[PDB]
Symmetry: C6
Subunit: 63 residues, 6 copies
């Protein structure tokens, strides 16, 4: 399932996000209700990481 | 249809924009009146995402 | 015809610039007096886009 | 052993980190208790270096 | 002739520089006394352009 | 001989550094006591150049 980046950030800051598996521009997201989806980073977002960390999201990268 | 980046940002600032499908420098735009056009990012714009999000534009990226 | 980047920015902020067709580092410029020339971005300039937009320059990118 | 980036930064902030061997996005980490693990940088983090240095972490890069 | 980047910036700051022909990391420099030399950008310098422009240096890029 | 980046910066700001020959991520360092070594930039460091220049370090780049 695919979700819009803006919606994803909305969920991040609405404290609904548990984990974010970032793979290049691809982010595999797990919600706090265990729902899983994939979203893509549209353009370089320097504010992304700090946003995830400030909202206590589990952040993971891939080989 | 193709539209200039500056004009596109103007429309973003006048809330005529519903969605922005960003694919590299190519942005496929859908207006609130359901109209379609294409604009290109001229140079890297760090303020782009912030602008789209502040104006509640649905932002989506592509694989 | 080719013009120095510094001169180009001078013209941009002296309100003499109508349009800027950016193609990578290549900028195709049209003056308000319809004179046309080409200038090149020497190094990455994060202040460029905002400068063009603040001076109401038509900004266009290429495929 | 592999550890999540956010958790890794948490440990950096709790001074449990002695060394950080950065190799691209791969960081080989040695804790103050001599423990070893690997973490990956999820997206470009401009605050990473500053964070490591503020917490007196030995930072090393590889050829 | 080759000159160190720091020294080059010093000359820029002492207004001994007339032109700076930037070609990637290579800068071909012409002093106000018509003298020629070459300097290389050591790492990406976001302050370079701003420095050249503040000191009224003619800045040019190459295809 | 190879030295940790953090240690290198420590030396830079302890005014022990005379010259820095940067070659990509590779920095060839000469101390004020004529000792020479090689260190590597671990991740992009935007604060590096300004740091070297503020501490009056000879900064040189390579072709």
């Amino acid at each position: 399932r695919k979700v819009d980046y803006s919606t994803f950030l909305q969920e991040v800051n609405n404290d609904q996000v548990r984990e974010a598996r970032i793979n290049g521009r691809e982010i595999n997201v797990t919600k706090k209700d265990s729902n899983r989806y994939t979203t893509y980073i549209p353009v370089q977002d320097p504010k992304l990481l700090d946003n995830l960390l400030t909202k206590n999201v589990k952040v993971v990268g891939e080989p």
